[PDB]
Design a protein around this ligand. Structure first.
Ligand SMILES: CCCCCCCCCCCCCCCCCC(=O)OC[C@H](COP(=O)([O-])OCC(O)COP(=O)([O-])OC[C@@H](COC(=O)CCCCCCCCCCCCCCCCC)OC(=O)CCCCCCCCCCCCCCCCC)OC(=O)CCCCCCCCCCCCCCCCC
Ligand SMILES: CCCCCCCCCCCCCCCCCC(=O)OC[C@H](COP(=O)([O-])OCC(O)COP(=O)([O-])OC[C@@H](COC(=O)CCCCCCCCCCCCCCCCC)OC(=O)CCCCCCCCCCCCCCCCC)OC(=O)CCCCCCCCCCCCCCCCC
Ligand SMILES: CCCCCCCCCCCCCCCCCC(=O)OC[C@H](COP(=O)([O-])OCC(O)COP(=O)([O-])OC[C@@H](COC(=O)CCCCCCCCCCCCCCCCC)OC(=O)CCCCCCCCCCCCCCCCC)OC(=O)CCCCCCCCCCCCCCCCC
Ligand SMILES: CCCCCCCCCCCCCCCCCC(=O)OC[C@H](COP(=O)([O-])OCC(O)COP(=O)([O-])OC[C@@H](COC(=O)CCCCCCCCCCCCCCCCC)OC(=O)CCCCCCCCCCCCCCCCC)OC(=O)CCCCCCCCCCCCCCCCC
Ligand SMILES: CCCCCCCCCCCCCCCCC[C@@H](O)O[C@H](CO[C@H](O)CCCCCCCCCCCCCCC)COP(=O)(O)OCC[N+](C)(C)C
Ligand SMILES: CCCCCCCC/C=C\CCCCCCCC(=O)OC[C@H](COP(=O)(O)OCCN)OC(=O)CCCCCCC/C=C\CCCCCCCC
Ligand SMILES: CCCCCCCC/C=C\CCCCCCCC(=O)OC[C@H](COP(=O)(O)OCCN)OC(=O)CCCCCCC/C=C\CCCCCCCC
Ligand SMILES: CCCCCCCC/C=C\CCCCCCCC(=O)O[C@H](COC(=O)CCCCCCC/C=C/CCCCCCCC)COP(=O)(O)OCCN
Lengths: 115, 140, 171, 83, 122, 347, 175, 98, 105
């Protein structure tokens, strides 16, 4: 209930700053002024055209390595168990396969960006 | 639902022909709506109103078939004083087949539907009389 | 399905222990040393009966033992104890460690006036034995009768008469 | 013996990060099985009383169960204070 | 839909319980074993024909191994099948015995006292 | 694809199926399906081309939808009983959702659309795998929860599968689509008997897998994927076309061939449960499968189609690779009817 | 009854689902799914699931960042669609909104079996348990048990993650 | 049942419907698949917390793991489709028929 | 279909997680532990067909603990009657139900 009040206060302050920024100063908007910036000149194509991603394979791999973090975050609590040999074996096993998947993609040129 | 089939079959055979005709028309309309849904899904009708027209065509044909069948069979049963007789269902099914043929405007479709629909309806009546099971329970 | 029986509000009355959690925490070790017997009786009752309605008298004995303990403390040295639990109470986590001088004074006080020895590390968490006159409850789950099993397999295995008997096969 | 020597030499010269990583990983894997304190950690975890110790009904045949916490029977945490 | 999977005291993956040994094993000239050997022989011949080798002559060690493998597996298949039929009959008889009120013995009539309907053929 | 990677992926597919088959917990069964699909997508694209990409994409979409539905059914079942064990479903709605999810995984009608397209889009080896090994897991799950399932929905989907398999197979000239429609009809047969006797389901599955393995291996041996390309095999390998002719008749279900045994066993079991009508429909409809098998046998073995001049060069070369189990598969696909009472060992 | 906070949160959850299911531009679909993930974090937090809520929020933030990159890379069109730039997207959005409205009305003013079963409402607080014990979080204990009880689960998930890396490398190879 | 449970099941139904009815982009369907997973996570978590099944607190994490694998798998296929056609449209993949 | 490798080898690959009454960490119990214990012990070894009829009482109690449908119905009935009798002024709520109780420890 305190965190909800905090979030509400912060969003309200930011929104009021935007409101002031838009309603206090004088506004003189014309087409030349509101046009897209490309350093002196008119853009050739649209900025909504497909923009190639050369690290597309590291982006997919990030999705799988980010879930390794969800499996490793309970580790401070897992350390409190009685069968520490099973916990340590399992935790070590998990990080070893994470290192092996990194070694696989590295040696197969999966970390190099497309050319 | 099969609650529609019960609202059809809860009415006795040669009694209240208007109610039985209404029930059979409802069954036919449901069937035609399902048919038109699958038809629109698998072969798009190129515009909204043409899909509406195809739906109306299919549903009206199916409901007309159901109406004619139920009306004819109930009336034939009550006039002949012969309930529990597959001939009434045969007459109704053949009338429904003639309805479908007049709808598609095809003499061959008319005759073929007369025959096959009548035989199917007579078989359904025989199964109701004898206790035949389509989806039998696992008895053993 | 049957009416639930509840004690009347009269049988639920007791002389309450109306001291706060800091006082309880400051006294906890000696309180567990001194009032062990009725507390253990009550917990054994509670965990064998699985019904709070069956252990009210043990709970009232628990209350009276706590009140006698605190009356002894009040009668022999309230001031060292008050110092100690005020120190404990200042802390937002109520940590024993930030109050060792006050705890030492309170401990010397009870050791000299009453002969109370603070339990050592690991003793209050022992599983102990309790001698009781309360009969061991027979069906604390109020179980029904279990259904009878299926009879069993028995006898010698003889080859099936006339083999498999599939349509035309003779074996 | 001399193949792996020059191999680790070239690795330390070209990829010291991977060398240190494999050393630290291998140590983390093998050292816990040679330690006399791993059992101490298991025992420390077992000595932490998270839930209430439910007492046992005395039947006159329990010579090794205490009847009061300060009685001498039961487990001892003395080894822990001196640790 | 699963009649014998849940039977009591059944080991998960035996293929041949110990109780099966109270049953007579199939003879080695059992016609079903001979048919399994014939299946192995046909497999050997088709093997020769596919690899464009002489059909009846090419690999005699190979054909012998085909026949032997088929006979070997078929022996144990027959043992398990006969054992399962013995289980079925055992259970059926025990169930009939323990539920006599479901399988009553009614007095049977001679045909002299049963009135049968006559239908002339004409 | 590196051979070691291909072996690892085949082993992961098989281990996912085995996880589905050995598990007692619904979550582990779901994990088995997930692992199977994960390893199976690359096997479809092993030979890269746009058609293989499209086939793998349609496959992934269908199977992942089925997976979500399966998980939702498990969660509803847990909500109405704190149970994770796979026995009999507690909630009727959860059972409907589960049945539809497994039908989508199997490709039963009306969820049959994916099977012909994906089968046509991949190679003959991947098609072999897709149509034999990919059926074990959902069928085993269905066998476990058989008492719980509603007969009306199951039998509806099974009869639809038989009808649609026959009708769709009638129109094909590509051999992979013929095999796919054959598979759809066979699945209909397997699932029609499931609420009555799971042993008949297992027997049907074993015989179907044997015949399908034989057919796919014969199609690989004579590297043909169309009807006209298979019409040449007589002028290079006549034994292959004769064996294919007999295997085709066994698939049709004609006696005294093995293919007739599953149909015969299923009809008999159904009659015991007072169900005369469903079986009469099923057999009369399998007549369609027999028709297009007979058409393929006409074009491939019983008559001789014209050939090409370059076939003379092929006359001079033996097959580089030989299939070890092809001979055994043909014999088990054709000559096993006298061994029918051995089905008791399956229960 | 009390403040019906979780009811408002679950309604906003459904609204975000309608937002991204209407199938508009992916930039706005990912926005809708982020909003849904955040309010689902809140829903779970209100029941005692702090770790699980925060975890699903973190995971979906990472996933939607990857999806934004892929949308600019392969999902772009000269005029990306919003919920009001298209009759089809707007119609799906409105139909989902008032379908949720009809479900909620029919459920809270009388007691109907929609599809599975029925419900009267009362607010979520009624089904709580009033349990009084512990120096720990039971959620944290059950999740930590993955390393002592759930050895088999750890094995199968680690294998699947390694195989997933190998698989994406195989799929995106080309040739 | 509780109002909250009804809302989560509705979210699953809406996402399932979204997946089923395709538009032009594949990425939108992939998003719908993710949405279904999100609703399954929430539903299972609510059921598990409510009944205090302690050991089942780990299954939503496993659910997320597999969901990530599925998401990764989906994006790979999209990369290959886009490389073939220069567009992630569903209509392009019509080479194979029934 | 189901090859019980666990039972043959005595492994416990996933049986530790199938039910709510089975060995939780720190002995934390399930909310419906006793009801489930009872339903499991009532139906053990008698097979699925007999268990559904002969253990329906235990299972109905278990489901009531799980979903609490009858409890919410009874509470709703009581509160509706309270609302109705209060609107007409026939019934007056006690002080300890309006916020003026004498709280006890
Ligand atoms: C008795 C009790 C109730 C009986 C119910 C069961 C009987 C059902 C009979 C319906 C037959 C369907 C097919 C035949 C018609 C041909 C289809 C067509 O489009 O041509 C229309 C044809 C002429 O139209 P056209 O424009 O010239 O067509 C040109 C093209 O050649 C034709 O178009 P096209 O070639 O361009 O392509 C159209 C497209 C169209 O696709 C279809 O037609 C789909 C057919 C499915 C319909 C199934 C309905 C049965 C449901 C009953 C529910 C109970 C109700 C309660 O075809 C396909 O693509 C086929 C794809 C195959 C995939 C199959 C998967 C779809 C669903 C399969 C079954 C449904 C499963 C449901 C449950 C599933 C859960 C397990 O005739 C009609 O217009 C008539 C329409 C329907 C008449 C039915 C008569 C109803 C009588 C009821 C009387 C009741 C009496 C009271 C009882 C007491
Ligand atoms: C737990 C499991 C439960 C799961 C299920 C739960 C689902 C709940 C969630 C629903 C909430 C909404 C969520 C958002 C979904 C996303 C929608 C989307 O993305 O659309 C993409 C999709 C394609 O996007 P696009 O490519 O960008 O647009 C291209 C143009 O649309 C097309 O280009 P075009 O103009 O060139 O094409 C011509 C035009 C032509 O369109 C047409 O031809 C349709 C015209 C037929 C009118 C129907 C006749 C009216 C009377 C029937 C009433 C029945 C009772 C009457 C009784 C007797 C009457 C006296 O369009 C089409 O051909 C496409 C066909 C689409 C038709 C709608 C699909 C529904 C199934 C097909 C049935 C067809 C109607 C047969 C009747 C069936 C029974 C009603 O958009 C659409 O196709 C329609 C707009 C979507 C808005 C409405 C969707 C809501 C319906 C969902 C299911 C309804 C509830 C299910 C059961 C409820 C009971 C529990
Ligand atoms: C196993 C051993 C051997 C057995 C196997 C061999 C025998 C079996 C099959 C042999 C042939 C039977 C096949 C039936 C005919 C199929 C029709 C057809 O193909 O349509 C496609 C064909 C394609 O046409 P389309 O492309 O759509 O349009 C262009 C048309 O050509 C343009 O046409 P249009 O514009 O020039 O005129 C068409 C129009 C007008 O047609 C005309 O222009 C000329 C008039 C022809 C009608 C004749 C009526 C006057 C004479 C009838 C005499 C009484 C009947 C016998 C009773 C004897 C009493 C002792 O047609 C009508 O609307 C006729 C209205 C109703 C009259 C006929 C219906 C009554 C049915 C009979 C019930 C009998 C119950 C049993 C009695 C119990 C005592 C034994 O349609 C036709 O062209 C044929 C039109 C004539 C059909 C009616 C004649 C049928 C004669 C009796 C049939 C009943 C036998 C089956 C028994 C099973 C019933 C459950
Ligand atoms: C080397 C020759 C050798 O060692 O033979 C010793 C063996 C010693 O015979 P045995 O047991 O002293 O003679 C008993 C009688 O044969 C009396 O024979 P049984 O009453 O022991 O018959 C055994 C039983 C079981 O036997 C079988 O199931 C396999 C027998 C071959 C079936 C016919 C198709 C293959 C030819 O036979 C059947 O159930 C007849 C059904 C077979 C037809 C299956 C349906 C499809 C038919 C094909 C269309 O004789 C043979 O193996 C003759 C060839 C077999
Ligand atoms: C076309 C003919 C079909 C050919 C089939 C393939 C034959 C070769 C396969 C290799 C044979 C070895 C398989 C079994 C060896 C040991 C494993 C054994 O322990 O399995 C037992 C089971 O034994 C096997 O199931 C028997 C396999 C025998 C298959 C052949 C029967 C074919 C039917 C009639 C056609 C005649 C075929 C002729 C042979 C070539 C486990 O019992 P259980 O775990 O409790 O049951 C699991 C299934 N449940 C629970 C659902 C019931
Ligand atoms: C049993 C139900 C009985 C259904 C009655 C209809 C059956 C008609 C079949 C007899 C043949 C009549 C005929 O002419 O078939 C044509 C007719 C189409 O019209 P055309 O004549 O080709 O158009 C002429 C201009 N091009 O054929 C069809 O489209 C219908 C074919 C399907 C028949 C129904 C089969 C349904 C099977 C599934 C049941 C479950
Ligand atoms: C409800 C569904 C019930 C299913 C019943 C299926 C009956 C089995 C028969 C299958 C016949 C299929 C015929 C067909 O599909 O096409 C007709 C075929 C197409 O020629 P294609 O070789 O495919 O192409 C050549 C050009 N490229 O045209 C022909 O000339 C057919 C010639 C042979 C037809 C044989 C029919 C014999 C039927 C005997 C009577 C009984 C049939 C079964 C029904 C019995 C009545 C209940
Ligand atoms: C048993 C321990 C396991 C657990 C610890 C490890 C956990 C995490 C560490 C491993 C992460 C994955 C490593 C992936 C290896 C990639 C190898 C590679 O291909 O990179 C080489 C670089 O590395 C190599 O040279 C290949 C392997 C050479 C040896 C690397 C270390 C091997 C082990 C060395 C130490 C042995 C053990 C420690 C003993 C210490 C001495 C007491 C190429 O570099 P590029 O980036 O492509 O350069 C581009 C511009 N030219």
């Amino acid at each position: 209930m305190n965190i909800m009040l905090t979030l509400l206060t912060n969003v309200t302050l930011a929104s009021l700053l935007v409101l002031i920024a838009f309603w206090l100063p004088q506004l003189n908007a014309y087409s030349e002024k509101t046009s897209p910036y490309e350093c002196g000149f008119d853009p050739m194509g649209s900025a909504r055209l497909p923009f190639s991603m050369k690290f597309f394979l590291v982006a997919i791999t990030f999705l799988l390595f980010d879930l390794e973090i969800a499996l490793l975050l309970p580790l401070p609590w897992a350390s409190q168990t009685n069968n520490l040999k099973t916990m340590l074996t399992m935790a070590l096993f998990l990080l070893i396969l994470l290192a092996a998947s990194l070694a696989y993609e590295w040696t197969q040129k999966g970390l190099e960006w497309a050319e | 639902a099969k609650t529609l089939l019960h609202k059809y079959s809860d009415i006795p055979e040669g009694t209240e022909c208007h109610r039985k005709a209404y029930a059979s028309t409802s069954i036919g309309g449901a069937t035609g709506l399902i048919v038109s849904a699958y038809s629109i899904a698998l072969k798009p009708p190129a515009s909204f109103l043409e899909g509406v027209a195809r739906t109306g065509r299919y549903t009206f044909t199916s409901a007309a078939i159901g109406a004619i069948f139920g009306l004819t069979s109930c009336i034939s049963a009550q006039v002949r004083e012969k309930p529990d007789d597959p001939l009434n269902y045969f007459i109704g099914g053949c009338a429904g087949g003639l309805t479908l043929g007049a709808r598609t405007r095809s003499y061959g479709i008319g005759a073929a539907a007369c025959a096959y629909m009548g035989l199917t309806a007579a078989l359904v009546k025989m199964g109701q009389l004898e206790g035949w099971q389509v989806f039998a329970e696992p008895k053993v | 399905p049957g009416i639930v029986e509840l004690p009347t509000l009269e049988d639920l009355k007791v002389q309450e222990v109306k001291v706060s959690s800091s006082v309880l925490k400051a006294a906890a070790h000696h309180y567990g040393a001194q009032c062990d017997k009725p507390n253990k009786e009550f917990m054994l009752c509670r965990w064998e009966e699985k019904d709070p309605r069956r252990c009210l008298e043990e709970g009232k004995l628990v209350n009276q033992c706590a009140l006698d303990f605190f009356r002894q403390i009040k009668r022999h040295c309230a001031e060292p104890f008050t110092e100690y639990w005020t120190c404990i109470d200042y802390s937002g986590l109520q940590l024993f460690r930030h109050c060792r001088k006050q705890q030492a004074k309170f401990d010397e006080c009870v050791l000299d006036k009453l002969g109370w020895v603070r339990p050592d590390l690991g003793e209050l968490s022992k599983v102990t034995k309790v001698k009781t006159d309360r009969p061991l409850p027979e069906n604390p789950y109020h179980s029904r009768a279990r259904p009878e099993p299926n009879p069993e397999a028995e006898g010698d295995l003889k080859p099936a008469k006339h083999g498999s008997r599939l349509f035309f096969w003779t074996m | 013996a001399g193949r792996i020597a020059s191999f680790l030499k070239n690795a330390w010269a070209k990829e010291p990060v991977l060398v240190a990583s494999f050393a630290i990983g291998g140590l983390a894997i093998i050292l816990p099985s040679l330690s006399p304190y791993t059992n101490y950690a298991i025992r420390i975890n077992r000595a932490t009383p998270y839930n209430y110790p439910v007492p046992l009904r005395d039947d006159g045949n329990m010579p090794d169960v205490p009847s009061h916490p300060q009685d001498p029977q039961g487990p001892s945490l003395e080894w822990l204070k001196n640790l | 839909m699963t009649m014998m999977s849940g039977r009591p005291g059944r080991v998960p993956l035996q293929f041949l319980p110990n109780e099966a040994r109270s049953l007579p094993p199939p003879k080695l000239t059992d016609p079903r074993l001979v048919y399994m050997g014939f299946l192995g022989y046909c497999s050997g011949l088709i093997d020769n024909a596919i690899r464009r080798r002489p059909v009846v002559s090419a690999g005699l060690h190979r054909q012998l191994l085909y026949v032997t493998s088929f006979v070997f597996f078929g022996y144990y298949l027959l043992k398990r099948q006969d054992y399962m039929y013995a289980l079925r009959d055992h259970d059926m008889f025990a169930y009939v015995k323990s539920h006599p009120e479901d399988f009553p013995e009614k007095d049977k009539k001679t045909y002299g006292e049963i009135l049968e309907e006559f239908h002339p053929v004409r | 694809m590196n051979p070691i990677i291909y072996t690892t992926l085949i082993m992961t597919v098989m281990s996912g199926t085995m996880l589905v088959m050995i598990s007692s917990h619904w979550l582990l069964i779901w994990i088995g399906f997930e692992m199977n699909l994960l390893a199976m997508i690359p096997v479809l694209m092993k030979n890269f081309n746009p058609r293989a990409t499209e086939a793998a994409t349609k496959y992934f979409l269908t199977q992942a939808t089925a997976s979500m539905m399966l998980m939702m059914a498990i969660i509803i079942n847990l909500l109405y009983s704190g149970q994770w064990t796979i026995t009999k479903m507690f909630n009727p709605v959860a059972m409907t959702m589960m049945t539809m999810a497994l039908a989508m995984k199997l490709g039963l009608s009306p969820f049959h659309f994916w099977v012909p397209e994906v089968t046509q889009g991949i190679s003959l080896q991947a098609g072999l795998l897709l149509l034999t090994w990919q059926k074990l897991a959902p069928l085993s799950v269905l066998c476990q929860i058989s008492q719980s399932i509603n007969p009306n929905l199951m039998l509806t989907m099974a009869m639809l599968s038989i009808l649609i398999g026959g009708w769709g197979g009638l129109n094909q000239t590509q051999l992979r689509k013929i095999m796919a429609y054959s598979s759809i009809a066979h699945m209909g047969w397997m699932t029609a008997v499931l609420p009555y006797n799971t042993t008949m389901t297992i027997l049907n599955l074993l015989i179907y897998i044997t015949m399908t393995l034989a057919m796919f291996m014969l199609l690989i041996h004579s590297s043909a994927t169309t009807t006209l390309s298979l019409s040449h095999t007589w002028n290079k390998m006549p034994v292959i076309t004769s064996l294919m002719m007999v295997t085709l008749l066994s698939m049709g279900g004609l006696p005294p061939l093995s293919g007739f045994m599953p149909k015969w066993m299923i009809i008999q079991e159904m009659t015991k449960n007072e169900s005369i009508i469903m079986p009469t429909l099923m057999a009369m409809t399998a007549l369609l499968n027999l028709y297009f098998y007979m058409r393929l046998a006409y074009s491939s073995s019983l008559t001789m189609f014209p050939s090409t001049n370059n076939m003379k060069m092929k006359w001079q070369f033996e097959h580089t690779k030989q299939m070890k189990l092809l001979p055994t598969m043909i014999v088990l696909s054709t000559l096993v009817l006298p061994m029918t009472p051995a089905l008791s060992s399956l229960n | 009854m009390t403040m019906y906070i979780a009811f408002i949160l679950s309604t906003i959850f459904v609204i975000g689902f309608v937002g991204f299911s209407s199938k508009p531009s992916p930039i706005y679909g990912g926005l809708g799914l982020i909003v849904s993930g955040g309010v689902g974090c809140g829903i779970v937090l209100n029941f005692g699931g702090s770790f699980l809520g925060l975890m699903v929020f973190l995971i979906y933030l990472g996933g939607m960042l990857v999806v934004f990159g892929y949308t600019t890379a392969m999902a772009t069109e000269m005029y990306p669609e919003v919920w009001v730039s298209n009759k089809t997207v707007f119609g799906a959005f409105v139909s989902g909104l008032m379908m949720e409205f009809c479900m909620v009305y029919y459920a809270l003013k009388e007691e109907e079996v929609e599809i599975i079963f029925k419900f009267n409402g009362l607010g979520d607080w009624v089904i709580y348990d009033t349990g009084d014990s512990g120096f720990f979080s039971e959620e944290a204990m059950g999740i930590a048990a993955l390393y002592s009880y759930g050895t088999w689960l750890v094995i199968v998930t680690g294998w699947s993650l390694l195989i997933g890396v190998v698989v994406i490398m195989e799929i995106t190879r080309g040739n | 049942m509780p109002l909250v449970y009804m809302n989560i099941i509705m979210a699953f139904a809406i996402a399932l419907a979204g997946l089923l009815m395709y538009r032009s982009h594949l990425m939108s369907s992939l998003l719908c698949l993710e949405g279904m997973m999100l609703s399954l996570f929430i539903m299972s978590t609510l059921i598990i917390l409510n009944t205090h099944f302690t050991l089942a607190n780990m299954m939503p994490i496993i659910l997320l793991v597999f969901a990530a694998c599925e998401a990764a798998l989906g994006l790979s296929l999209l990369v290959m489709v886009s490389n073939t056609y220069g567009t992630d449209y569903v209509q392009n993949l019509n080479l194979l028929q029934c | 279909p189901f090859f019980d490798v666990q039972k043959r080898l005595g492994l416990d690959l996933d049986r530790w997680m199938t039910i709510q009454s089975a060995e939780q960490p720190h002995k934390i119990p399930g909310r419906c532990h006793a009801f489930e214990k009872e339903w499991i012990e009532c139906a053990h070894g008698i097979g699925g067909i007999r268990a559904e009829k002969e253990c329906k009482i235990e299972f109905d109690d278990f489901v009531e603990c799980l979903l609490r449908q009858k409890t919410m119905k009874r509470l709703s009935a009581i509160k509706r009657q309270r609302d109705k009798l209060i609107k007409e002024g026939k019934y007056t709520p006690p002080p300890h139900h309006l916020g003026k109780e004498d709280p006890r420890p």
